[PDB]
Amino acid sequence: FQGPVSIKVQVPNMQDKTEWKLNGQVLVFTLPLTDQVSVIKVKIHEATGMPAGKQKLQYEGIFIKDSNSLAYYNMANGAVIHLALKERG
Amino acid sequence: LYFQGPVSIKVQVPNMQDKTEWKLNGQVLVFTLPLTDQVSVIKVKIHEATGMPAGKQKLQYEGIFIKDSNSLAYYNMANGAVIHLALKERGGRKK
RNA sequence: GGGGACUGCGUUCGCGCUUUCCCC
RNA sequence: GGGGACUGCGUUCGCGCUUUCCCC
């Protein structure tokens, strides 16, 4: 059986970022476990306008890397990815 | 039939023993120079006597900061004129 | 931004201009 | 030398690099 996993992305609420759609919403994506974490950033960009280089992703306290797979982090159905605006310095 | 002779001037040298390349021992120099000589000639005589280059010398005569291009006559120097010698120190904003 | 040295010059002797540099 | 913004980016989340700059 197995299959793609359903993941949740907690988007921040940042109304001052008027060019992006950061409304504190939860995105639901279903992705293969073999997908790289960068696919999450593609889906988030499509959903919010926020480019991948501006996104910082955290999963159960882990700063997950774009080049690694979802399987590398042992994500299951309902895995919650916390999205933050990446801060320089 | 009068002919204006040279003037005898005295240079009070400072006592600065830390300037080991020069002879600044607090001595008094005596030079005899024509009144038509430029003040710059005094610095030459001082350089010859003390090793101190003309560009490092500051001269003062009766409170006047005399200028190199002017003559001794311009400053009305007479026999026994006392030239005070000091070290020139440059200034300037930090670059 | 600050400290220091140096090349030469101007000065109302307080400083300023300038050259080549070093350090924080 | 120090503090910071900005471009792209890295991070072991303490920070780092980079781009164009600002302030002292």
UniProtKB/Swiss-Prot annotation, chain B:
Occurrences of domain Ubiquitin-like (ranges): 9-95
Disulfide bonds: none
Residues with the Phosphotyrosine modification: 61
Residues in coiled coil: none
Subcellular localization, as worded in the UniProt entry: Nucleus; Nucleus speckle
Tissue expression pattern: Ubiquitously expressed.
Domain commentary: SURP motif 2 mediates direct binding to SF3A3.
Subunit structure, interactors included: Component of the 17S U2 SnRNP complex, a ribonucleoprotein complex that contains small nuclear RNA (snRNA) U2 and a number of specific proteins. Part of the SF3A subcomplex of the 17S U2 SnRNP complex which is composed of three subunits; SF3A3/SAP61, SF3A2/SAP62 and SF3A1/SAP114. SF3A associates with the splicing factor SF3B and a 12S RNA unit to form the mature 17S U2 small nuclear ribonucleoprotein complex (17S U2 snRNP). SF3A1 functions as a scaffold that interacts directly with both SF3A2 and SF3A3. Identified in the spliceosome 'E' complex, a precursor of the spliceosome 'A' complex.
Role played: Component of the 17S U2 SnRNP complex of the spliceosome, a large ribonucleoprotein complex that removes introns from transcribed pre-mRNAs. The 17S U2 SnRNP complex (1) directly participates in early spliceosome assembly and (2) mediates recognition of the intron branch site during pre-mRNA splicing by promoting the selection of the pre-mRNA branch-site adenosine, the nucleophile for the first step of splicing.
Name of the protein in question: Splicing factor 3A subunit 1
Species of provenance: Homo sapiens (Human)
Taxonomic lineage: Eukaryota, Metazoa, Chordata, Craniata, Vertebrata
Gene: SF3A1
Portion of the parent chain present: 703 to 793 of 793
